[PDB]
Write a protein that binds this ligand. Structure first.
Ligand SMILES: O=C1c2ccccc2N[C@@H](c2ccccc2F)N1c1ccccc1
Ligand SMILES: O=C1c2ccccc2N[C@H](c2ccccc2F)N1c1ccccc1
Length: 149
């Protein structure tokens, strides 16, 4: 165990995703919302999402989170996996996090013209992997399996 491993565990222990939603970045329409902490590691989460999301050039995300611990550079790396192959990756940076704060993070997520296979082929075969970092310290990795409905 290193000092860094111990730190990453303290950060994870103090972290919660309280709620989240997704919107077409054209309409601002809600496409999905939830309060399950999809960031919790070690379980495969499941989400059902409307199939039309696949027709959106971009989506806007609101992610509401609490952190007991101070973070210098809170960031995420997110990958779409189809039957085990990475189709697309995104990097997003929140930056400094105040200890014991609760924060809403808005992000614009742009698909590359990926999300090209039909929803019927995709559904149950897509995993979004999310890695949570503070700078280069890996805090956690979680996974959501997607169903398009
Ligand atoms: O941002 C998230 C997200 C945030 C915290 C924890 C897990 C996440 N996984 C996906 C995501 C968001 C909403 C619904 C399902 C889903 F898999 N996700 C997402 C949404 C769009 C593009 C890339 C990742
Ligand atoms: O299915 C989605 C999607 C659905 C809900 C939440 C996150 C998702 N990640 C991407 C995606 C789809 C549309 C717009 C942006 C985007 F990152 N995405 C996707 C999936 C497979 C191939 C390409 C993009």
């Amino acid at each position: 165990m290193s000092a860094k491993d111990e730190r990453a565990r303290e950060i994870l222990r103090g972290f919660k995703l309280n709620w989240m939603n997704l919107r077409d970045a054209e309409t601002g329409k809600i496409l999905w919302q939830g309060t399950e902490d999809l960031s919790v590691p070690g379980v495969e989460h499941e989400a059902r999402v409307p199939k039309k999301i696949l027709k959106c050039k971009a989506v806007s995300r609101e992610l509401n989170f609490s952190s007991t611990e101070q973070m210098e550079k809170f960031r995420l790396e997110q990958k779409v996996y189809f039957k085990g192959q990475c189709l697309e990756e995104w990097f997003f940076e929140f930056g400094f996090v105040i200890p014991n704060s609760t924060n809403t993070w808005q992000s614009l997520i742009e698909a590359a013209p990926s999300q090209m296979m039909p929803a019927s082929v995709l559904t149950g075969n897509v995993i979004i992997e999310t890695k949570f970092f503070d700078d280069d310290l890996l805090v956690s990795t979680s996974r959501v399996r997607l169903f398009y409905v």
